[PDB]
Design a protein around this ligand. Structure first.
Ligand code: NGA
Ligand code: CA
Length: 150
């Protein structure tokens, strides 16, 4: 049906008003109001910054069998990937403490990054943004969606 997801991670890395909740608020557009962003850089001497790698933890209140999860990347209006978007990501799944390497996806250029899970069962998934298209202090993600196996 509808699947309750809890997201956690270091909110001190993120831009005000653009926190972890924006990963699961049901907004997949690239608008500022939809996204989770690492702290924006406002001045040339700013020392308060977020840094990659950035780890995002997703938990379900009970194990779920998943078809996939889908990361929605920040895109420009012309369909090209924005400079602040994710470029490289890895993920790990857990079930009863057992750890499962879900692998890394690199050179991301598309509107979505999809981890096909083929009905594997997890109670926790940890997604780590490793690189963006700009620098290690920049990251924008529109949404991350989880699709349950029937
Ligand atoms: C118009 C535009 O793209 N503004 C971006 C902002 O969205 C965010 O990425 C910020 C991070 O420092 O940098 C700006 O360049
Ligand atoms: Ca969103």
């Amino acid at each position: 049906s509808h699947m309750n997801i809890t997201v956690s991670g270091d909110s001190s890395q993120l831009q005000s008003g653009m926190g972890l909740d924006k990963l699961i608020d049901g907004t997949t557009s690239s608008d500022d109001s939809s996204r989770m962003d690492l702290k924006w850089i406002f001045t040339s001497d700013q020392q308060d910054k977020g840094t990659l790698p950035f780890e995002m933890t997703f938990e379900f209140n009970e194990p779920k069998t998943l078809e996939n999860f889908t990361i929605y990347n920040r895109m420009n209006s012309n369909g090209t990937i924005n400079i602040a978007a994710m470029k490289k990501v890895k993920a790990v799944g857990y079930l009863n403490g057992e750890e499962f390497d879900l692998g890394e996806k690199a050179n991301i250029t598309s509107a979505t990054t999809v981890y096909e899970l083929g009905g594997k069962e997890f109670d926790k998934i940890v997604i780590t943004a490793l690189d963006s298209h700009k620098d290690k202090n920049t990251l924008a993600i529109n949404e991350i969606e989880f699709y349950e196996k029937s």
